[PDB]
Swiss-Prot record:
Origin species: Homo sapiens (Human)
Record localization: Cell membrane
Residues bearing attached sugar chains per UniProt: N58, N79, N118
Shown residues within the full chain: 222 to 417 of 650
Disulphide-bridged cysteine pairs: C25-C74, C123-C174
Cited function: Receptor for class I MHC antigens. Recognizes a broad spectrum of HLA-A, HLA-B, HLA-C, HLA-G and HLA-F alleles. Receptor for H301/UL18, a human cytomegalovirus class I MHC homolog. Ligand binding results in inhibitory signals and down-regulation of the immune response. Engagement of LILRB1 present on natural killer cells or T-cells by class I MHC molecules protects the target cells from lysis. Interaction with HLA-B or HLA-E leads to inhibition of FCER1A signaling and serotonin release.
PTM characteristics: Phosphorylated on tyrosine residues. Dephosphorylated by PTPN6.
Record comment regarding domains: Contains 4 copies of a cytoplasmic motif that is referred to as the immunoreceptor tyrosine-based inhibitor motif (ITIM). This motif is involved in modulation of cellular responses. The phosphorylated ITIM motif can bind the SH2 domain of several SH2-containing phosphatases.
Location of the Ig-like C2-type domain: 1-89, 90-186
Name by which UniProt lists this protein: Leukocyte immunoglobulin-like receptor subfamily B member 1
Complexes and interactors: Binds PTPN6 when phosphorylated. Binds FCER1A and FCGR1A. Interacts with human cytomegalovirus/HHV-5 protein UL18. Interacts with peptide-bound HLA-G-B2M complex. Interacts with peptide-bound HLA-F-B2M complex but not with peptide-free HLA-F open conformer. It does not probe the peptide sequence directly.
Expressed in which tissues: Expressed in B cells, monocytes and various dendritic cell (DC) subsets including myeloid, plasmacytoid and tolerogenic DCs (at protein level). Expressed in decidual macrophages (at protein level). Expressed in decidual NK cells (at protein level).
Length: 194
């Protein structure tokens, strides 16, 4: 039970079917191998090797399907011993395009703005969704999960951005979600350009 490794995803936890995302299993505890597991699956998926001085191993999930949705963990080990590290923190991976119903991403004012404008891009759907995820073709770190409201025979959720800055003007996407299927997401909506 050594220092657990860290599991990150590039560029995000949301992957479309037939696509690829890479997982990084790294540590500063100087491991020389890492093993990737999927929570609730007996055999490990992959096993690699590294070189510390920190050490790292990349795992790639090739052309993904619905069944790739779930929780992943990795372990680190040293050269000689068979002692494997403590489990890493669980990585949630979600799969897009897994519902019949589709969602639409609109914008309250317009796609074109000068700084200080309050924009409120919307995410709608005729089909039932519990939560809507807002994401950005951006650099890093986490989708924005809001809960849905049934407005005008149409489920939706407003995403306030308030006073806008240059750091905002990227590419957007929203998804629909149901809690019965945690790691499954609706088809992405069309990109919205700011």
């Amino acid at each position: 039970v050594s220092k657990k490794p860290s599991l990150s995803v590039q560029p995000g936890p949301i992957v479309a079917p037939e696509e690829t995302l890479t997982l990084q299993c790294g540590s500063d505890a100087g491991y020389n191998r890492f093993v990737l597991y999927k929570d609730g699956e007996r055999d490990f998926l992959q096993l690699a090797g590294a070189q510390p001085q920190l050490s790292q191993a990349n795992f790639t999930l090739g052309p993904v399907s619905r069944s790739y949705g779930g929780q992943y963990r990795c372990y680190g080990a040293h050269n000689l011993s068979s002692e494997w590290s403590a489990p890493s923190d669980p990585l949630d991976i979600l799969i897009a395009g897994q519902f019949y119903d589709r969602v639409s991403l609109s914008v309250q004012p317009g796609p074109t703005v000068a700084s200080g404008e309050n924009v409120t891009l919307l995410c709608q759907s005729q089909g039932w969704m519990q939560t809507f995820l807002l994401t950005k073709e951006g650099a890093a770190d986490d989708p924005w999960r809001l809960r849905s409201t049934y407005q005008s025979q149409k489920y939706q959720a407003e995403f306030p951005m308030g006073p806008v800055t240059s750091a905002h003007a990227g590419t957007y996407r929203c998804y629909g979600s149901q809690s019965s299927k945690p790691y499954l997401l609706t088809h992405p909506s069309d990109p919205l350009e700011l």
